[PDB]
UniProtKB/Swiss-Prot annotation, chain A:
NCBIfam families: cbbA, fruc_bis_ald, PRK05835.1
Cofactor dependence: Zn(2+)
EC number: 4.1.2.13
Keyword 4Fe-4S: no
Binding site for Zn(2+) 1: 83, 165, 195
Molecular functions per Gene Ontology: fructose-bisphosphate aldolase activity; zinc ion binding
Protein name: Fructose-bisphosphate aldolase
Entry keyword set: Glycolysis, Lyase, Metal-binding, Zinc
Known catalytic reactions: beta-D-fructose 1,6-bisphosphate = D-glyceraldehyde 3-phosphate + dihydroxyacetone phosphate
Cofactor binding note from Swiss-Prot or TrEMBL: Binds 2 Zn(2+) ions per subunit. One is catalytic and the other provides a structural contribution.
Active-site residues per Swiss-Prot or TrEMBL entry: 82
UniProt: D-glyceraldehyde 3-phosphate binding residues: 49
BP terms from Gene Ontology: fructose 1,6-bisphosphate metabolic process; glycolytic process
Length: 292, 293
């Protein structure tokens, strides 16, 4: 059933595993994520960006998720606003029924980030909703993280340790500051969040290229880095790019192999399957499989 | 809001216009259909086939439509089971919250078609749900059979076979519908009538699909003029699916062709929604349901 984000992440924190946080923009993505969680017996963090909310409408984003959680009532599910940019956005998500909200003020100076985060926390906690915030851009200062968490009362923190969003994360070799991560974890003792955590697995890349796609020199976070991140105290692992590439690879394939095909289900059934398999493998990698 | 199918179609029957019945299989199709109805001030008949219901799950099919009707509460909306094949399928749709169900037993002899339809009607009417049935197969409808079939079954609307078929490939040569048979059916039954396989494949939609590398294999729809004549003859519900799929997928193919690095689903499906919406808007104007709210 649909639960506060901290309910899922406190367990992952205490037991030392990672929960993938999977973005969706429509029914097909959402269905595949849920089927993956059902098949791997894994809790689900479902995320919607502000852009996804604009595309679906917040009423449909929440409504579809509520239908899915009634279909799979044994699965712990949190519905999370990804990269909320203003207090008002976070407040709208709370009012609409989200159970976790992220306020991203990491581009502000510490004092302003702390003030805005604290405002969001007060509002969200009054409504029984968990809150994520972000520190670092430059990498996180662990002593700032310690004070920020203590003063804001935020439920989970995304510390900058070297990742970035999209398919092009490393101009060179993948590198994450695990010593910094461990220090943040030691000083905050809360669940931590890894942004930009897609891996671009070799099989997903191969499917995309076989379908005529171009991955312009892309590079994701190696599986070993994700596992080391979880060992270091990461408990929420934001995953979007991997899902899109696997989904769209199959759409492109169907378009290429039959120019007379226009049944939407013939495009999106294989697309769902590929997305589902990415999610299932990620749940096993992160250690959330068989945790229900 | 969400209403019995007959509420929408009795008005169309009495005033002599047609209401498009637009199939959907996911959120993108549904959103575009609703925005079209809002922009043209038109009632909405939303249809889901058994295959679409299996794909979405009946809980999600009904649930998404209820969310959309709350987003646009001034629009009359009926949610209709398209080509239900068994009593049990129709009953499941009634229980899930559909407001209209179609039972297609037209491949049976008259007596068996009438028996099964009557069973569906009794069940659906007891739940406040309207019912469509089909007569004729290909063999065209016998108007005197239509008259007795409607009187005995109490079905709310009838799809009489007058020369259409489903899919993109409708006519081996020139389109042809039996409008005299239609008028006789209408005169004898005096209920709303339904046209199946009513996509037109407009020139611009065909051109968009071909520009995107698609192949329509010499497909031909019902010309706009034949759709208007069918409404003049008494058609009030016009089943439309293929046109929407072609317009939508044309845009998906185009995005895939023009940017090999694009994998944002919204960049594929926003232009696809727009193309589908425009097909629906034009069809609402053609059939005469625009400005009828
Ligand atoms: O970190 C994230 C995903 O990382 P990824 O690119 O999958 O490595 C998410 O929090 C993103 O913020 C999200 O995918 C952005 O979505 P849109 O803003 O494009 O909808
Ligand atoms: O006439 C019925 C529907 O258009 C067929 O749609 P389907 O391909 O989902 O069965
Ligand atoms: Na987030
Ligand atoms: Na029908
Ligand atoms: Zn981020
Ligand atoms: Zn992010
Ligand atoms: Zn971030
Ligand atoms: Zn039919
Ligand atoms: Zn039919």
């Amino acid at each position: 059933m649909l639960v506060k984000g901290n309910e899922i992440l406190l367990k992952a924190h205490k037991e030392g595993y990672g929960v993938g946080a999977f973005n969706f923009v429509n029914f097909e993505m959402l269905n595949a994520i849920f089927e993956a969680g059902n098949e791997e017996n894994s809790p689900l963090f479902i995320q919607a960006s502000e852009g996804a909310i604009k595309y679906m409408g917040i009423d449909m984003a929440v409504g579809m998720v509520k239908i899915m959680c009634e279909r799979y009532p044994h699965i712990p599910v949190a519905l999370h606003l990804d990269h909320g940019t203003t207090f008002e956005s976070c407040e709208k998500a709370v009012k609409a029924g989200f159970t976790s909200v992220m306020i991203d003020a990491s581009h502000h100076a510490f004092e302003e980030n702390l003030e805005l985060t604290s405002k969001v926390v007060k509002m969200a906690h009054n409504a029984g909703v968990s809150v994520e915030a972000e520190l670092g851009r430059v990498l996180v200062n662990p002593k700032e993280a310690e004070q920020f968490v203590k003063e804001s009362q935020v439920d989970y923190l995304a510390p900058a340790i070297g990742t970035s969003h999209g398919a092009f994360k490393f101009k060179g070799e993948p590198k994450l500051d695990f010593e910094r991560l461990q220090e943040v974890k030691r000083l905050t003792n809360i669940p931590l969040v890894l942004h930009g955590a897609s891996a671009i697995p070799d099989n997903v890349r191969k499917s995309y290229l076989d379908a005529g796609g171009d991955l312009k020199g892309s590079k994701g976070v190696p599986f070993e880095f994700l596992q080391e991140s979880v060992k270091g105290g990461i408990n929420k692992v934001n995953t979007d790019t991997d899902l899109r590439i696997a989904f769209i690879a199959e759409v492109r394939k169907v378009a290429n192999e039959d120019k007379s095909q226009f049944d939407l289900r013939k495009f999106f059934s294989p697309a769902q399957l590929a997305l589902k398999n990415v999610v299932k493998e990620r749940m096993k990698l992160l250690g959330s499989a068989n945790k229900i």
